[PDB]
PDB file of C-alpha atoms in Angstrom:
ATOM      1  CA  UNK A   1      88.049 107.590  92.794  1.00 49.34           C
ATOM      2  CA  UNK A   2      86.607 104.020  92.572  1.00 48.96           C
ATOM      3  CA  UNK A   3      87.557 101.380  90.030  1.00 48.87           C
ATOM      4  CA  UNK A   4      85.748  98.132  89.789  1.00 49.70           C
ATOM      5  CA  UNK A   5      87.905  95.623  88.060  1.00 46.14           C
ATOM      6  CA  UNK A   6      85.924  92.723  86.784  1.00 44.98           C
ATOM      7  CA  UNK A   7      87.371  89.343  85.086  1.00 44.45           C
ATOM      8  CA  UNK A   8      84.955  88.192  82.385  1.00 45.67           C
ATOM      9  CA  UNK A   9      87.411  85.792  80.963  1.00 45.25           C
ATOM     10  CA  UNK A  10      87.068  82.223  81.340  1.00 46.36           C
ATOM     11  CA  UNK A  11      90.559  81.963  82.930  1.00 45.08           C
ATOM     12  CA  UNK A  12      92.126  83.426  86.190  1.00 43.47           C
ATOM     13  CA  UNK A  13      93.823  86.669  85.755  1.00 45.09           C
ATOM     14  CA  UNK A  14      96.002  88.482  88.493  1.00 45.45           C
ATOM     15  CA  UNK A  15      94.944  92.024  88.104  1.00 45.55           C
ATOM     16  CA  UNK A  16      97.478  94.941  88.940  1.00 46.78           C
ATOM     17  CA  UNK A  17      97.227  98.526  89.514  1.00 49.09           C
ATOM     18  CA  UNK A  18     100.287 100.878  89.952  1.00 49.63           C
ATOM     19  CA  UNK A  19     101.386 104.279  89.117  1.00 53.34           C
ATOM     20  CA  UNK A  20     105.150 103.018  88.514  1.00 54.35           C
ATOM     21  CA  UNK A  21     106.682 103.984  91.916  1.00 54.25           C
ATOM     22  CA  UNK A  22     103.804 102.720  94.165  1.00 56.31           C
ATOM     23  CA  UNK A  23     100.841 100.470  94.325  1.00 56.97           C
ATOM     24  CA  UNK A  24      97.605 101.661  93.767  1.00 55.23           C
ATOM     25  CA  UNK A  25      95.170 100.321  96.639  1.00 57.79           C
ATOM     26  CA  UNK A  26      96.592  96.773  97.394  1.00 57.94           C
ATOM     27  CA  UNK A  27      98.501  96.827  93.874  1.00 60.09           C
ATOM     28  CA  UNK A  28      97.346  93.378  92.937  1.00 57.56           C
ATOM     29  CA  UNK A  29      94.902  90.505  93.498  1.00 57.56           C
ATOM     30  CA  UNK A  30      93.765  87.247  91.979  1.00 58.43           C
ATOM     31  CA  UNK A  31      90.679  87.324  90.068  1.00 58.51           C
ATOM     32  CA  UNK A  32      88.858  84.238  89.161  1.00 59.61           C
ATOM     33  CA  UNK A  33      86.386  83.961  86.339  1.00 57.97           C
ATOM     34  CA  UNK A  34      83.663  86.334  87.014  1.00 57.84           C
ATOM     35  CA  UNK A  35      85.192  87.829  90.118  1.00 57.58           C
ATOM     36  CA  UNK A  36      84.944  91.796  90.795  1.00 62.42           C
ATOM     37  CA  UNK A  37      87.590  93.638  92.847  1.00 62.10           C
ATOM     38  CA  UNK A  38      86.669  97.314  93.836  1.00 59.98           C
ATOM     39  CA  UNK A  39      89.835  99.638  94.471  1.00 58.13           C
ATOM     40  CA  UNK A  40      90.088 103.411  95.495  1.00 61.00           C
ATOM     41  CA  UNK A  41      92.529 105.585  93.705  1.00 61.11           C
ATOM     42  CA  UNK A  42      93.394 108.792  95.262  1.00 63.26           C
ATOM     43  CA  UNK A  43      92.216 111.787  93.401  1.00 60.68           C
ATOM     44  CA  UNK A  44      95.022 113.613  91.608  1.00 62.70           C
ATOM     45  CA  UNK A  45      96.822 110.403  90.722  1.00 63.31           C
ATOM     46  CA  UNK A  46      98.840 110.893  87.326  1.00 62.58           C
ATOM     47  CA  UNK A  47     100.066 108.029  85.237  1.00 63.92           C
ATOM     48  CA  UNK A  48      98.211 105.329  86.763  1.00 63.77           C
ATOM     49  CA  UNK A  49      97.808 101.836  85.007  1.00 63.67           C
ATOM     50  CA  UNK A  50      95.682  98.669  85.453  1.00 64.49           C
ATOM     51  CA  UNK A  51      96.457  95.463  83.454  1.00 62.33           C
ATOM     52  CA  UNK A  52      96.021  91.627  83.813  1.00 61.13           C
ATOM     53  CA  UNK A  53      98.559  89.148  84.345  1.00 64.68           C
ATOM     54  CA  UNK A  54      98.347  85.627  83.056  1.00 62.84           C
ATOM     55  CA  UNK A  55      99.627  82.218  84.175  1.00 62.26           C
ATOM     56  CA  UNK A  56     101.042  83.274  87.735  1.00 61.80           C
ATOM     57  CA  UNK A  57     102.332  81.466  90.564  1.00 62.39           C
ATOM     58  CA  UNK A  58     102.749  82.831  93.870  1.00 61.39           C
ATOM     59  CA  UNK A  59     103.836  81.432  97.205  1.00 64.83           C
ATOM     60  CA  UNK A  60     102.414  82.397 100.501  1.00 67.86           C
ATOM     61  CA  UNK A  61     104.426  85.523 100.648  1.00 65.42           C
ATOM     62  CA  UNK A  62     103.028  86.962  97.601  1.00 67.35           C
ATOM     63  CA  UNK A  63     106.235  86.221  95.686  1.00 67.66           C
ATOM     64  CA  UNK A  64     106.287  84.253  92.401  1.00 66.67           C
ATOM     65  CA  UNK A  65     106.045  84.752  88.450  1.00 67.23           C
ATOM     66  CA  UNK A  66     103.543  85.383  85.782  1.00 72.24           C
ATOM     67  CA  UNK A  67     104.041  84.563  82.093  1.00 76.14           C
ATOM     68  CA  UNK A  68     102.787  88.173  81.133  1.00 79.18           C
ATOM     69  CA  UNK A  69     102.626  91.323  83.038  1.00 78.17           C
ATOM     70  CA  UNK A  70     104.993  90.183  86.013  1.00 77.82           C
ATOM     71  CA  UNK A  71     105.913  93.200  88.137  1.00 77.67           C
ATOM     72  CA  UNK A  72     109.140  91.991  89.540  1.00 79.40           C
ATOM     73  CA  UNK A  73     107.708  88.761  90.947  1.00 82.08           C
ATOM     74  CA  UNK A  74     105.082  90.277  93.259  1.00 82.19           C
ATOM     75  CA  UNK A  75     101.502  89.493  93.824  1.00 82.30           C
ATOM     76  CA  UNK A  76     100.972  93.203  95.001  1.00 86.95           C
ATOM     77  CA  UNK A  77     102.670  95.353  92.044  1.00 85.68           C
ATOM     78  CA  UNK A  78     104.518  98.467  93.066  1.00 85.95           C
ATOM     79  CA  UNK A  79     105.954  98.966  89.516  1.00 84.46           C
ATOM     80  CA  UNK A  80     104.572  98.500  86.009  1.00 90.84           C
ATOM     81  CA  UNK A  81     104.740  94.831  84.556  1.00 90.25           C
ATOM     82  CA  UNK A  82     106.888  93.188  81.907  1.00 89.53           C
ATOM     83  CA  UNK A  83     105.251  93.344  78.378  1.00 91.01           C
ATOM     84  CA  UNK A  84     103.098  92.212  76.673  1.00 86.77           C
ATOM     85  CA  UNK A  85     100.366  93.861  78.727  1.00 86.97           C
ATOM     86  CA  UNK A  86      97.206  95.609  77.390  1.00 89.09           C
ATOM     87  CA  UNK A  87      97.080  98.786  79.406  1.00 87.62           C
ATOM     88  CA  UNK A  88      94.401 100.729  81.014  1.00 90.32           C
ATOM     89  CA  UNK A  89      95.826 104.223  81.577  1.00 90.08           C
ATOM     90  CA  UNK A  90      94.547 107.246  83.584  1.00 88.49           C
ATOM     91  CA  UNK A  91      95.359 110.586  85.003  1.00 87.51           C
ATOM     92  CA  UNK A  92      92.863 111.804  87.402  1.00 89.29           C
ATOM     93  CA  UNK A  93      91.558 115.507  88.403  1.00 95.37           C
ATOM     94  CA  UNK A  94      94.237 117.214  85.897  1.00 92.24           C
ATOM     95  CA  UNK A  95      92.892 120.766  85.876  1.00 89.46           C
ATOM     96  CA  UNK A  96      89.398 119.610  86.564  1.00 88.46           C
ATOM     97  CA  UNK A  97      89.299 116.622  84.124  1.00 87.27           C
ATOM     98  CA  UNK A  98      90.167 112.960  83.945  1.00 84.54           C
ATOM     99  CA  UNK A  99      91.846 111.307  81.006  1.00 81.91           C
ATOM    100  CA  UNK A 100      91.612 107.625  80.320  1.00 84.09           C
ATOM    101  CA  UNK A 101      92.874 105.469  77.342  1.00 84.26           C
ATOM    102  CA  UNK A 102      93.698 102.000  76.269  1.00 83.19           C
ATOM    103  CA  UNK A 103      97.293 101.417  74.989  1.00 82.42           C
ATOM    104  CA  UNK A 104      98.995  98.551  73.123  1.00 81.30           C
ATOM    105  CA  UNK A 105     102.317 100.415  73.182  1.00 81.54           C
ATOM    106  CA  UNK A 106     103.583  97.511  75.548  1.00 81.12           C
ATOM    107  CA  UNK A 107     101.628  94.878  73.606  1.00 79.78           C
ATOM    108  CA  UNK A 108      98.539  93.054  74.189  1.00 78.53           C
ATOM    109  CA  UNK A 109      97.862  90.037  76.467  1.00 75.66           C
ATOM    110  CA  UNK A 110      94.075  90.150  77.548  1.00 74.51           C
ATOM    111  CA  UNK A 111      91.204  92.059  75.787  1.00 73.27           C
ATOM    112  CA  UNK A 112      89.678  94.883  77.730  1.00 71.66           C
ATOM    113  CA  UNK A 113      86.879  97.620  78.004  1.00 71.91           C
ATOM    114  CA  UNK A 114      87.753 100.589  80.260  1.00 74.83           C
ATOM    115  CA  UNK A 115      84.402 102.613  80.852  1.00 76.48           C
ATOM    116  CA  UNK A 116      83.262 105.113  83.260  1.00 77.65           C
ATOM    117  CA  UNK A 117      80.340 104.346  85.613  1.00 79.14           C
ATOM    118  CA  UNK A 118      79.430 107.761  86.128  1.00 77.67           C
ATOM    119  CA  UNK A 119      78.139 110.191  83.551  1.00 78.15           C
ATOM    120  CA  UNK A 120      79.474 112.458  80.754  1.00 76.80           C
ATOM    121  CA  UNK A 121      82.093 110.533  78.760  1.00 74.61           C
ATOM    122  CA  UNK A 122      82.318 107.318  76.710  1.00 75.25           C
ATOM    123  CA  UNK A 123      84.437 104.210  77.349  1.00 75.05           C
ATOM    124  CA  UNK A 124      87.070 102.463  75.093  1.00 75.74           C
ATOM    125  CA  UNK A 125      87.534  99.135  74.230  1.00 76.36           C
ATOM    126  CA  UNK A 126      90.301  96.567  72.725  1.00 79.08           C
ATOM    127  CA  UNK A 127      88.490  93.329  72.323  1.00 78.72           C
ATOM    128  CA  UNK A 128      89.788  91.641  69.169  1.00 77.18           C
ATOM    129  CA  UNK A 129      91.692  88.533  68.902  1.00 76.46           C
ATOM    130  CA  UNK A 130      95.118  90.113  68.849  1.00 73.88           C
ATOM    131  CA  UNK A 131      97.027  87.159  70.280  1.00 75.50           C
ATOM    132  CA  UNK A 132      95.366  84.825  67.721  1.00 73.43           C
ATOM    133  CA  UNK A 133      96.242  87.142  64.659  1.00 75.17           C
ATOM    134  CA  UNK A 134      99.683  88.328  66.098  1.00 75.93           C
ATOM    135  CA  UNK A 135     102.488  88.357  63.432  1.00 74.48           C
ATOM    136  CA  UNK A 136     105.045  85.675  63.891  1.00 73.85           C
ATOM    137  CA  UNK A 137     107.902  87.810  65.046  1.00 75.43           C
ATOM    138  CA  UNK A 138     105.923  89.446  67.816  1.00 73.90           C
ATOM    139  CA  UNK A 139     104.348  86.424  69.264  1.00 71.50           C
ATOM    140  CA  UNK A 140     105.408  85.916  72.915  1.00 66.36           C
ATOM    141  CA  UNK A 141     106.279  82.250  73.899  1.00 66.65           C
ATOM    142  CA  UNK A 142     104.554  82.815  77.366  1.00 64.74           C
ATOM    143  CA  UNK A 143     101.459  84.252  75.729  1.00 65.54           C
ATOM    144  CA  UNK A 144     100.588  87.425  74.227  1.00 65.05           C
ATOM    145  CA  UNK A 145     101.430  89.767  71.223  1.00 63.75           C
ATOM    146  CA  UNK A 146     104.535  91.809  72.064  1.00 66.61           C
ATOM    147  CA  UNK A 147     104.945  95.519  70.458  1.00 67.05           C
ATOM    148  CA  UNK A 148     107.692  96.021  68.151  1.00 66.04           C
ATOM    149  CA  UNK A 149     109.813  98.317  70.628  1.00 65.57           C
ATOM    150  CA  UNK A 150     110.066  95.352  73.058  1.00 65.48           C
ATOM    151  CA  UNK A 151     111.207  92.912  70.577  1.00 68.14           C
ATOM    152  CA  UNK A 152     113.423  94.835  68.213  1.00 71.30           C
ATOM    153  CA  UNK A 153     114.764  97.871  70.517  1.00 71.15           C
ATOM    154  CA  UNK A 154     115.068 100.330  67.449  1.00 68.92           C
ATOM    155  CA  UNK A 155     114.685 104.066  67.840  1.00 68.28           C
ATOM    156  CA  UNK A 156     111.990 103.928  65.118  1.00 69.04           C
ATOM    157  CA  UNK A 157     109.803 101.555  67.070  1.00 65.28           C
ATOM    158  CA  UNK A 158     110.522 102.951  70.490  1.00 69.27           C
ATOM    159  CA  UNK A 159     110.287 106.564  69.249  1.00 66.51           C
ATOM    160  CA  UNK A 160     113.557 107.442  71.039  1.00 69.58           C
ATOM    161  CA  UNK A 161     114.174 110.580  69.229  1.00 69.41           C
ATOM    162  CA  UNK A 162     110.664 111.825  69.585  1.00 70.89           C
ATOM    163  CA  UNK A 163     110.374 111.413  65.883  1.00 71.08           C
ATOM    164  CA  UNK A 164     108.852 108.211  64.500  1.00 70.65           C
ATOM    165  CA  UNK A 165     106.134 106.935  62.170  1.00 69.51           C
ATOM    166  CA  UNK A 166     103.938 104.155  62.118  1.00 71.20           C
ATOM    167  CA  UNK A 167     105.148 100.842  61.272  1.00 71.54           C
ATOM    168  CA  UNK A 168     104.020  97.498  59.738  1.00 66.73           C
ATOM    169  CA  UNK A 169     103.624  96.248  63.329  1.00 67.00           C
ATOM    170  CA  UNK A 170     102.023  99.504  64.769  1.00 63.54           C
ATOM    171  CA  UNK A 171      99.350  99.152  61.955  1.00 58.57           C
ATOM    172  CA  UNK A 172      98.626  95.605  62.978  1.00 58.50           C
ATOM    173  CA  UNK A 173      97.541  96.751  66.313  1.00 56.43           C
ATOM    174  CA  UNK A 174      95.701  99.690  65.068  1.00 58.22           C
ATOM    175  CA  UNK A 175      93.779  97.685  62.547  1.00 59.65           C
ATOM    176  CA  UNK A 176      92.343  95.371  65.197  1.00 59.29           C
ATOM    177  CA  UNK A 177      91.962  97.865  67.847  1.00 59.84           C
ATOM    178  CA  UNK A 178      91.568 101.500  66.372  1.00 58.66           C
ATOM    179  CA  UNK A 179      90.693 102.984  69.720  1.00 56.96           C
ATOM    180  CA  UNK A 180      93.813 102.051  71.376  1.00 56.33           C
ATOM    181  CA  UNK A 181      97.408 103.694  71.230  1.00 56.45           C
ATOM    182  CA  UNK A 182      99.507 101.605  68.747  1.00 54.31           C
ATOM    183  CA  UNK A 183     102.706 103.674  68.790  1.00 55.59           C
ATOM    184  CA  UNK A 184     104.269 106.469  71.160  1.00 54.79           C
ATOM    185  CA  UNK A 185     103.042 109.258  68.706  1.00 60.31           C
ATOM    186  CA  UNK A 186      99.691 107.689  67.457  1.00 58.71           C
ATOM    187  CA  UNK A 187      96.911 110.130  67.217  1.00 57.63           C
ATOM    188  CA  UNK A 188      95.645 110.292  70.606  1.00 56.16           C
ATOM    189  CA  UNK A 189      92.581 107.940  71.555  1.00 56.73           C
ATOM    190  CA  UNK A 190      92.402 109.531  74.981  1.00 53.83           C
ATOM    191  CA  UNK A 191      88.864 110.274  76.474  1.00 53.85           C
ATOM    192  CA  UNK A 192      88.371 113.270  78.621  1.00 55.06           C
ATOM    193  CA  UNK A 193      85.920 112.692  81.371  1.00 55.34           C
ATOM    194  CA  UNK A 194      84.622 114.742  84.083  1.00 56.24           C
ATOM    195  CA  UNK A 195      87.099 115.204  87.062  1.00 56.04           C
ATOM    196  CA  UNK A 196      86.395 112.635  90.071  1.00 54.64           C
ATOM    197  CA  UNK A 197      84.671 110.127  87.471  1.00 52.19           C
ATOM    198  CA  UNK A 198      84.559 106.354  88.746  1.00 53.14           C
ATOM    199  CA  UNK A 199      85.143 103.495  86.376  1.00 54.04           C
ATOM    200  CA  UNK A 200      84.986  99.749  85.423  1.00 52.07           C
ATOM    201  CA  UNK A 201      87.782  97.887  83.804  1.00 51.58           C
ATOM    202  CA  UNK A 202      86.572  94.465  82.335  1.00 50.43           C
ATOM    203  CA  UNK A 203      88.784  91.811  81.207  1.00 52.27           C
ATOM    204  CA  UNK A 204      87.477  89.697  78.226  1.00 52.71           C
ATOM    205  CA  UNK A 205      84.521  92.198  77.717  1.00 56.82           C
ATOM    206  CA  UNK A 206      82.956  90.141  74.774  1.00 58.14           C
TER     207      UNK A 206
END
């Protein structure tokens, strides 16, 4: 499957793509404002994520640091990134269907649209100014708006027992972005697309 990753933000982002134990495609790249990066993701990929990283410094070897979404100091991510990260999540060719969503479970850094470029399903977006409106206790110094599990590490926020409810913090994310997951047991906002669809992820869609 083809994903085109487009940076419409006015600032540089460093896109990342991983399935947690391996890179997808090259795993990461710098995107200046307006640049597009096209990746190929193997059919059958389960548990893939794409995200943006901000305020990164990398040396010639591709080693460095980012203020949001750092994936162990690497330009080319093999593992998932450090919160806060708005996430585009997908599982492809799962019994004939692809499943896509946007999640705020690991916080929010950059607004995002995640849409098919082929026919037969809808896209999803979270484009509100979550960073500007972020509750004081969830604001990340480096930038972004952390989820409450990251900040407080309680069973209730992290849904450790598999039983948890919405919280004042989850409802903040949900009010601003209803079509994104706000906590682990949120009513699913997953979209079902035809198997082998192609997609575009746009940072700063609006």
